[PDB]
Amino acid sequence: NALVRRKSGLPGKLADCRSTDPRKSELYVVEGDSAGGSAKSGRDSMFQAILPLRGKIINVEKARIDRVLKNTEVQAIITALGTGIHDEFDIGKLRYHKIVLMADADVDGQHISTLLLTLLFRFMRPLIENGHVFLAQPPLYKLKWQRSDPEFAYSDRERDGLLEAGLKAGKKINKEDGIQRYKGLGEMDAKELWETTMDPSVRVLRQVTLDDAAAADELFSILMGEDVDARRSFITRNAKDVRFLDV
Amino acid sequence: ALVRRKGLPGKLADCRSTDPRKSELYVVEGDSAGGSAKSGRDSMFQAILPLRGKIINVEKARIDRVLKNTEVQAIITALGTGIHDEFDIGKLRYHKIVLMADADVDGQHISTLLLTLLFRFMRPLIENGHVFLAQPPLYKLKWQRSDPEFAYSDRERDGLLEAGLKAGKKINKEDGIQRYKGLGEMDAKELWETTMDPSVRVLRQVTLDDAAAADELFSILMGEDVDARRSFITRNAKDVRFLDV
Amino acid sequence: IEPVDIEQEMQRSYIDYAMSVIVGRALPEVRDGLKPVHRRVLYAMFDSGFRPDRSHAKSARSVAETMGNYHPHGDSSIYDSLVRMAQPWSLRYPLVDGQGNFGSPGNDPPAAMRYTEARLTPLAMEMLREIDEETVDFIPNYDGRVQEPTVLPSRFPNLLANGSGGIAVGMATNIPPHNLRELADAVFWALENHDADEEETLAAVMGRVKGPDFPTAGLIVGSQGTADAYKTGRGSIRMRGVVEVEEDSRGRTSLVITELPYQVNHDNFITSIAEQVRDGKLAGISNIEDQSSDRVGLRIVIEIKRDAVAKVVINNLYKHTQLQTSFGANMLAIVDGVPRTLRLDQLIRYYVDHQLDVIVRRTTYRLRKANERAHILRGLVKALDALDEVIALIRASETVDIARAGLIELLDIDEIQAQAILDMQLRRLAALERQRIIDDLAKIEAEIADLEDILAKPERQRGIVRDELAEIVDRHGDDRRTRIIAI
Amino acid sequence: IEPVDIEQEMQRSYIDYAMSVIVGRALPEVRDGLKPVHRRVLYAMFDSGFRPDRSHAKSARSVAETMGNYHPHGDSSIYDSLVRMAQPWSLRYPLVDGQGNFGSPGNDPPAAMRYTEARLTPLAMEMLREIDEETVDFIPNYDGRVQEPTVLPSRFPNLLANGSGGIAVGMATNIPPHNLRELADAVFWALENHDADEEETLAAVMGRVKGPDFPTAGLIVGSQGTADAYKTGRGSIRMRGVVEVEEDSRGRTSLVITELPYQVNHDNFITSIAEQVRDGKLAGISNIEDQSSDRVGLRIVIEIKRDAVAKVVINNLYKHTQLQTSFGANMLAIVDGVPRTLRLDQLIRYYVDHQLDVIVRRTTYRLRKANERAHILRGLVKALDALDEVIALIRASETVDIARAGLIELLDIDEIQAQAILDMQLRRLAALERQRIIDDLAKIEAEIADLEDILAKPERQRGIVRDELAEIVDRHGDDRRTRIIAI
DNA sequence: TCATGAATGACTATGCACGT
DNA sequence: TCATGAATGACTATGCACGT
Ligand SMILES: C[C@H]1COc2c(N3CCN(C)CC3)c(F)cc3c(=O)c(C(=O)O)cn1c23
Ligand SMILES: C[C@H]1COc2c(N3CCN(C)CC3)c(F)cc3c(=O)c(C(=O)O)cn1c23
Ligand SMILES: [Mg+2]
Ligand SMILES: [Mg+2]
Ligand SMILES: [Mg+2]
Ligand SMILES: [Mg+2]
C-alpha cells in the first residue's frame, strides 16, 4: 500500500513527508503556528509530516455533526489522515500509521488533547484501538551547562536530578542564563524540537490505549457532553484525587 | 437630495442629512482615528470614511488595477460622482471633502496620493472648491486649573504657554504638554474640538490656479520617471522653507 | 514506548484544565475581586511606576511588562483585558486610566495598542496600597525570576464594587457592580458588629446595600431578584433603560432613550429595533434615528405614528428588545482556593476579614522594621557617649575588620550595629546631628509602643479599617447611577 | 477658511516626505551603517540591560521599550526589524541574539513576538561601547521626555560588514556585507597611511577587501563588478550557489545544491525549478527532491535524465533560475545628513574619522571626570594630614554648614571638596583605607598624565583605534564564507 | 442563536527604486 | 511581475456556562 504525498488535494497547511509508505510515515498534529513552523524545520522530512492546528478545536461531542464538518481545522485532520469518519471509515486508506499529538505542556495543551482525542474516538475510533494514536511529551527545562552539552528535563523531578548529578560530577551552570523553562512548544527552535520530541531515538511517546469501550463512552460523554451538571459533579468528585491515580 | 445608508462602502459612517450642500465627508487616515472621529463627529452633517494603508498611486498604476483597489472604490462610491469622462458634479453626495491625515510625513504622503487621485479622476471637485485639508493639533496644554488649550504649531505652543504663565496659570512638568504624533492618539472629544467642530476647526481649501503647471508637477512627483523626480527634489528641497516667505 | 489508557488521560487532562481555569483564570478571588490577568496587569503597571503622579505610559509597555514577568500569555488578549479595565461603561470604578481611543458602548472597537497610553487610576492605587509592607503573600512568577502577589491589599471592596463575570468549567460567575458608599456603610456595620451572626449581619448589610449600581445607570425594577441574589447567591434582577416622551410642533410624539441597561450594545440595540420593524413586529414606530454624540450622550429617537400610544410602544420595546433585560446574578467567587457561591453577608465578612489581615500584617511589618531601626540607633548612641574612644579605636585599627571586631568588644554591641557605626558619616558627628540620633531613638520607641498597642487591641485594628476606608470613600465615592423603583 | 494652492501643497508635502524617508528611514548613516529603527531598537535593548550578561528578555519588552521612548511607530513592523537583525542568513554579523523561532531562509515565517526572546549580541555590545562616555551626540526623543543617540560608537565598521539595502524616494541603497577581518586590514592601512591621497587609498583598500562576504556563503564569479562597485559606487556582482554532481549505483546522476546566492528564498527557488519543468523549460531534469534538514543544512537534490549532460543542466539552471543571480550594488549612504554614493576608500575613511572622533571624545570625558575625582581626592588628603583638627571643627558646629565653612578656612578648600569630606564615612579612617585614599590620588594623576598625552598626540589616538579594533576582530572575526573565483 | 471574556496569529494591500 | 525592508491593524473561529 502506497499513497502520493503533496509536492507543488490535501490541506494547505500540511507539510507532508516524502515517504509514500504509511507504515513508515508519521503525522505530527501540532498546537500553534509557531510550534508547527519549528517542527516543519526540525523534522525528518522523509517520514515526518506536520499539521499545525490553529486555536481550540471544536468539541464534536457538543456541536452538531454538520457544524463539525464545516470547521476548517477538523476538515484538515480528516483530509490529512485519509480515512473517512464513522461508518465510512477505512483503515486501509490511512496515510500515516503514527499520529502524534503534540501540544504544550501547559493547561491549554491538555485541553486541546482532550478535544482531539474526542474527535478521534467519536469519528475514527479504530485509530485508537489499533495503536496509531500517540502523545508526545514536550520538555519543561533545558539545563545549559557551561562546558558540557545541554540536557533536557521533562519534569520538575528530573530537573532536580540532572542538576544535582551534574554538579556532583563537577559541571557548572550560570545562575543567569541557567535553566531555561519552556512554557510551550512555540518557544522552542527547530533543533530543540528534534532532540526532544521528533528524533525517534530520543523522543518520549505515549501510545493511547483503549481498554473498556463502554467506560470510555461514558467518560467522554460526561466530560465533553452538553450536560453541565454531570460534568460539574464529576470534577468536584474526582479532582480531589487526581494526584493519586498512579500511586 | 440623496439617500444616506441606514449600496455604499461598508466602512462608510454616513451622515443623517440628505442634503449634499450641507453634508461633509471626512476622509480619515487610519481605523483608530476614523473610529474616534465617528464618535466625535456631528452625525447630522458629517460622515466618516476611514482609509487603510497607503493609497495606490494612480499616476504610476494602470487604470484597471486602480479600479480593483478597495480603498479607491470606497472613495469613488462614497463621493457619488463618476470618474474621468463619466464624472458628474450633480451626483456629488458631499459638497465638503475634508482630508484628515496625521501631522507626520506619512500623513503628508497620503495627502499627496489622495490629491493625485482627485486631480486625475475627479478634477472638478478641486476646481469648484469641494476639497479641503484639516489641520490636526500638535500640542495640548493641560493647565492645572484652567481649560486645556490646543496648539497647531511649535510657535503657537510657545505663545500660548508664555501668555498663560504671564496670566498666572500653571502646568505640571510631568503631565504637562501632551504632544500628538497622530490622529489615532486622540479621543472623540479632542478631535471634535480641534478638527471637526465647524466653529474652531482649521480647514484649508485646495485651489487650482494653473492647470497645466499642476499637470506637470503631478507627473514629475508622482510619475514613474525617477530621474525627473530625483533631480526635482535635489533642486527644490533646498528651498521648501521659503515657499511662503 | 509507554502505554497509557484513554480514560486515565482524558480524566487527568480535563480535570487539570477545569481546575486551573476555575481557580486560575475565569473566576475572581473574593478578597480583591480580581482574576489573575487583572491582578498581574495592575501590579505590572504599579511596579513599572505607571501611576497617576506621572504621565500615561504607552500601553504597549504595560502589556509587555505583564507578559515578560507575570502573565505567560499573549499580548493581544492581555491588551483586551487592560482596555476593559479603562472603559467607564464596563467598570463601575475603572482601575486603568486610559488616554486615547478605548472604544465605545457600541460596536466601535478600541484602537490598537500603539495608539493608546495608560496608567493606574487613584482607586487602583488603593488596590495596591502598602503592598510593599508584607501585607499580602507573594509567590515566585512563572519562571521563578521574580515575585508576584497572590492577592492585592484591596483597600476598597472591589469585587462588590466593580462586580465580575466569568465563564469557567462546570460553572460560571456573574456578580453585578455596586455603589461604593453603600458598600462602605455595610463594611462599617460589619466592623462595629463584629460578633453579629450571619442572620443579623445579612439583615443589616441588605438594608445598606440597596442593590447593584451599574455604570450605565438605567433602572432596576422590583426587589425580589435583588433579595434572592443576596440571600441565595442567585437571582434575576430586572433592568430598564430610561425613556422620555417628547412632543413635536406638528404634534407628533417621539420616544427618546437616553440610558440602557448594563452590558447592552448601543448599536446592536438600534439594529434589533430596525430589524423588528422591517418584518414589522413593532408597529406604531414611524422612524428610528440615532441623535447620539459625545456631547449629549446616548440619544435614540423613536418617532411613533399618530395612531400610536406612547406606553404601548414602550411596553412593546420592553418585551421585544433589551430596553428591558434581566441580569442573571450568580455570586460565585474563589474562597481560599475553592469556588463558592456566597451570600451578601459572606461577601462583606470575607472582605472585612481580608482588611483586618492586611492591617495586622502591615502593623507587624512596621513593628519589625521599627525594632531594627531602633536597634541600630541604640548602637549609635553608645558610640556617641564614647565618641572620643570610638574614633581613636577605628583610627588605630590596621583594617576595617580589625576596627569592626573591636567595636563589638569596646561598646558591647552587635556586628550589625557596629557596622552602622563604621558606615556613619562625618556629617552626623556635628552637635545638632548627634542630637537628631538621640531624638530619633525617642521618636521610634514611641512608634514601637504605638504599633505594639495596635496588635494587642482588636478594637484599634477595626478602627483603622473604618477610618482608612472612610478617607477613600469621601475622596472617591460617587452618587448612585442606577435608580431603584418598585413594580 | 484659508486658501491653499494645490502646487504649493503637493510640492511642500511630498518633499518633506521624501527628505525624511531619505535621511530618516530607508538609508543607513555612513558612520555606523544603521537606519533609525535599528539604532533605536539596539539602544532600547542596551538601556534596558538586555545584554549578553543576562538572560534573553521577552522580545515584546524590547519592542515596547523602543516604541515607547524612541521610535514613534507600530509594534508589528518594529518587531520585524528586530527579528531580521537576529537572522544569521540576513545579517553577516547578527546584532540581536534571538531565542526561539525566528524563521528560516525559506517561506517559514518567524514566530510572533509572544513566543520569542531576545538580547544584544557581543558584537552589538561593540556598537554601543562606551556610549555613556559622551562619545556621541544625543538629542531629545520624539516627545522630549528622554535623550537618544544620533549615532552609535560602532567600534567595528558595521556598514560595510553587515551591508544595507533600502528603498527611499528618488533613490535607493544596496551595500553588500563584507568579511570583518578584511575590513580591519583596510582600516589598519588607513590608520597607518593617514596622509595618503584618495588615489593610493583606493588601491590599498581594494587589495585588502577582496570582495563581499555573504552570510549565505556561495560563490562570486568575476572581478569586474566588484571593482566597479569600489571605484564607482555602482556595480553588478555575479553570485552563484554551490553544486556537486553525485553518481548513483543505477547510473543516474544528480545535482546537489548545498548553497544559494545572497537573499534567495530556498522555497521560491525549488518552486521555480519545479514550475519550469511543469511547463517544460528545463528538460534533462528527472526529479526534484528537497533533502534539507536542520542537521545537514540546505540540500536540494536534482536527479537528471541519463541522456542529459550534468554541465548542460547546470548552465540551464544558471540561466533560468536564481542559482546564478546578480547583486546590484549601489553604495549609497547618508553622510552628514546628505545622501551620497561613495567609493570604498571614502567608506573606510569616513568610518575611521568616526572612530577617531569617538576616542578623542572618550578621552576628553575621561579627562574631565579624572580631574573631578582628583580634585576631590586632593581635599581628602588635606583632611588626613590634619585629621585631628577636622573632627574637632565638625563637632562644635550647630549645623553642617558651620562645619563646612570652617573646613574651607582650615584647609583652604572648595565647597565641593569640603562636602566630600563631610560625606566621608568612618569606614575610611582605618589605616589601609587612609593609605588607599593617598594611592588613589597618585593613580589618577598618573591616569590624567596618560589622558593628556592621548589628546596631544594624534599618533596614540590612531593607535587606540587599531589596538582596540584588533581585539574585537580577534574575538569576533570569522572565516570568509563566499568563495571568490575567476571567469 | 447571540451576548459575555479569558484562553488558543496568519493573511490581506499599498509607497518607494532597481534589477530581473 | 517579484523580491527586497521599514512605513501606513481589522477580521477570522473555536471552549466554556447561562439566559433570553
Ligand atoms: C490562536 C491564534 C490563531 O488562530 C486564531 C483565530 N483563527 C482560528 C483558526 N482559524 C479558524 C482562523 C481564525 C482567530 F479567529 C482569532 C485568534 C486571536 O484572536 C488570537 C489572539 O491572540 O487574540 C490568537 N489566535 C487566533
Ligand atoms: C495600515 C494597517 C491597516 O492596513 C494593512 C493591510 N491592508 C489591510 C486590507 N486593506 C485592503 C489594505 C491594507 C495589510 F495588508 C497589512 C498591514 C500591516 O502589516 C500593518 C502593520 O503595522 O504591520 C498595518 N496595516 C496593514
Ligand atoms: Mg500554550
Ligand atoms: Mg502617523
Ligand atoms: Mg483576540
Ligand atoms: Mg505588517
Question: Residue B12's domain is classified under what CATH number?
Answer: 3.40.50.670
Written as nine digits, the cell of C83 is 482596555
Half-sphere exposure of D231 (CA within 13 A, CB side): 13
Ligand that lies nearest to the alpha carbon of residue C112, given by its number in the listed order: 2
Give the integer Cα–Cα distance in Å for D346 and C460. 79
The neighbouring-strand residues paired with D241 are none
Written as nine digits, the cell of B59 is 499616476
Helix (H) or strand (E) holding A72: helix A72-81
Q: What is the DSSP letter of B242?
A: G
- CA–C1' distance C352–F18 (Å)? 31
Taking the Cβ of residue D143 and every Cβ of chain C, the question of whether any pair is shorter than 8 Å is answered with no
- The bridge status of strand A179-181 relative to strand B46-51 is unpaired
DSSP per residue over B106-123, as a string?
A: HHHHHHHHHHHHHHHH-T
From the CA of D77, how far away is ligand 6's center (Å)? 5
- Check if the beta carbon of residue B169 is closer than 8 Å to that of residue B145: yes
Q: Which nucleotides of E are covered by protein (CB under 7 A)?
A: 2-11, 13-20
Helix (H) or strand (E) holding C139: strand C138-140
Alpha helices in D48-113 (DSSP H): 59-69, 75-84
What is the resolution of the experimental data for this entry, in Å?
2.5
CB-strand contact C168/F, under 7 Å: yes
Q: Return the number of other C-beta atoms located less than 10 Å from residue B97's C-beta.
A: 26
Distances (CA, A) of C402 to C393, C417, D438: 10, 15, 21
Find, among C158, C156, C161, C151, the residue nearest to C131 by Cα: C151
Does residue B52 have its Cβ closer than 6 Å to ligand 2?
Answer: yes
Q: Which residue is nearest to nucleotide E19 (CA to C1')?
A: D328
- Check if the beta carbon of residue C333 is closer than 8 Å to that of residue C31: no
Q: Which of C426, C429, C434 to mutate to test the interface with D (most CBs of D within 10 A)?
A: C426
3-state secondary structure of B151: strand
Give the integer Cα–Cα distance in Å for A26 and A134. 10
Residues in D touching A38 (Cβ below 8 Å):
101, 111
Q: Given an 8 Å threshold on Cβ–Cβ distance, is B40 in contact with C294?
A: yes
- Check if the beta carbon of residue D340 is closer than 8 Å to that of residue D347: no
Q: Residues 6 or more apart from D242 whose CB is under 8 A from it?
A: D217, D218, D219, D257, D258, D259
**Nearest atom of ligand 2 to the alpha carbon of B30:** 1
Half-sphere exposure of B63 (CA within 13 A, CB side): 4
Residues in D touching C403 (Cβ below 8 Å):
430
Find, among B151, B12, B145, the residue nearest to B73 by Cα: B12
Q: Which of B110, B240, B244, B245 to mutate to test the interface with D (most CBs of D within 10 A)?
A: B240
- CA–C1' distance D255–E17 (Å)? 36
Do B and A touch, counting CB pairs below 8 Å (3 needed)?
no
Give the integer Cα–Cα distance in Å for A93 and C207. 71
Helix (H) or strand (E) holding A115: helix A107-123
Strand F neighbours among D 218-277, CB < 7 A: 263, 265, 268
Strand E neighbours among D 22-61, CB < 7 A: 26
Please provide the distance, in angstroms rounded to a whole number, between the alpha carbons at the two ends of chain D: 69
Q: Residues 6 or more apart from A124 whose CB is under 8 A from it?
A: A78, A81, A83, A85, A89
Give the integer Cα–Cα distance in Å for A69 and A60. 9
Q: Given an 8 Å threshold on Cβ–Cβ distance, is D275 in contact with A8?
A: yes
Instruction: Name the one residue in this structure whose C-alpha cell is 542529459.
Output: D308
Determine the residue of chain A that is closest to C143 in CA distance.
A181
Q: Given an 8 Å threshold on Cβ–Cβ distance, is C13 in contact with A114?
A: yes
Cα-Cα-Cα-Cα dihedral sign, residues C449, C452, C454, C458: negative
Of C7, C21, C170, the CB nearest to A216: C7
Written as nine digits, the cell of D192 is 597607518
The protein residue with its alpha carbon nearest to ligand 2, atom 10, reads B52
DSSP per residue over B21-44, as a string?
A: GG-EEEEEESHHHHHHHHHHS-TT
- CA–C1' distance D218–E15 (Å)? 33
Angle at D256 between CA D252 and CA D260, to 5 degrees: 155
The protein residue with its alpha carbon nearest to ligand 1, atom 1, reads A55
Q: Residues 6 or more apart from A180 whose CB is under 8 A from it?
A: A141, A142, A144, D99
Instruction: Tell me the Cα Rg of chain A.
Output: 20
CB-strand contact A230/F, under 7 Å: no
Taking the Cβ of residue D423 and every Cβ of chain B, the question of whether any pair is shorter than 8 Å is answered with no
Distance from CA of B16 to the nearest CA of C (A): 9
Does residue D77 have its Cβ closer than 6 Å to ligand 2?
Answer: yes
Distance from CA of B6 to the nearest CA of D (A): 32
- Check if the beta carbon of residue C133 is closer than 8 Å to that of residue C48: no
Q: Given an 8 Å threshold on Cβ–Cβ distance, is D391 in contact with C395?
A: no
The protein residue with its alpha carbon nearest to ligand 1, atom 24, reads A55
- AA identity, residue A183: K
Of A110, A181, A245, the CB nearest to C17: A110
- Check if the beta carbon of residue C127 is closer than 8 Å to that of residue C155: yes
Determine the longest span between alpha carbons in chain C, in angstroms: 109
Residues in C touching D114 (Cβ below 8 Å):
67, 73-75
Please provide the distance, in angstroms rounded to a whole number, between the alpha carbons at the two ends of chain A: 44
Written as nine digits, the cell of D97 is 541574539
Instruction: Tell me the Cα Rg of chain C.
Output: 30
Of B35, B40, B41, the CB nearest to C109: B35
Q: What is the DSSP letter of B56?
A: P
Cβ-in-10-Å burial (0-12, 13-18, 19+) of B233 comes to buried
Written as nine digits, the cell of C483 is 435608580
Angle at B7 between CA B4 and CA B11, to 5 degrees: 75
CB-strand contact D442/E, under 7 Å: no
3-state secondary structure of A28: strand
Angle at D457 between CA D453 and CA D462, to 5 degrees: 115
For chain B, what is the domain count? 1
Of B105, B206, B233, the CB nearest to D9: B206
Distance from CA of C43 to the nearest CA of A (A): 21
Of A135, A207, A219, the CB nearest to C7: A219
Catalytic, out of A108, A156, A160, A189: A108
Phi, psi angles (nearest 5°) of residue C197: -80, 175
Q: What is the DSSP letter of A198?
A: I
Give the integer Cα–Cα distance in Å for D10 and B243. 12
Q: What method did the depositors use to determine the structure?
A: X-ray
Chain C stretch 47-86, residues whose beta carbon is closer than 8 A to a beta carbon of chain D: 55, 57-58, 60-61, 63-65, 67-68, 73-75
- The bridge status of strand A26-31 relative to strand A141-143 is unpaired
Q: What is the DSSP letter of D109?
A: P
Cβ-in-10-Å burial (0-12, 13-18, 19+) of C29 comes to buried
Q: Given an 8 Å threshold on Cβ–Cβ distance, is B204 in contact with D3?
A: yes
Testing ligand 2's pocket by substitution, the residue of D77, D83, D84 carrying the most ligand atoms inside 8 A of its CB is D77
Give the integer Cα–Cα distance in Å for D184 and D157. 8
Q: Is A31 annotated as a binding residue?
A: yes
Does residue A55 have its Cβ closer than 6 Å to ligand 1?
Answer: yes
Give the integer Cα–Cα distance in Å for A50 and D220. 37
Residues in A touching C142 (Cβ below 8 Å):
181, 183
Taking the Cβ of residue D1 and every Cβ of chain C, the question of whether any pair is shorter than 8 Å is answered with no
From the CA of D75, how far away is ligand 6's center (Å)? 9
Give the integer Cα–Cα distance in Å for D86 and D84. 5
Cα-Cα-Cα-Cα dihedral sign, residues B44, B50, B55, B56: negative
Catalytic, out of C43, C115, C351, C365: C115
Give the integer Cα–Cα distance in Å for C195 and A165. 58
Distance from CA of C45 to the nearest CA of D (A): 13
What ranges do the domains of chain C cover?
Answer: 1-487
Q: Given an 8 Å threshold on Cβ–Cβ distance, is A34 in contact with D293?
A: no
C-alpha D156, offset from chain centre: 7
From the CA of D113, how far away is ligand 5's center (Å)? 15
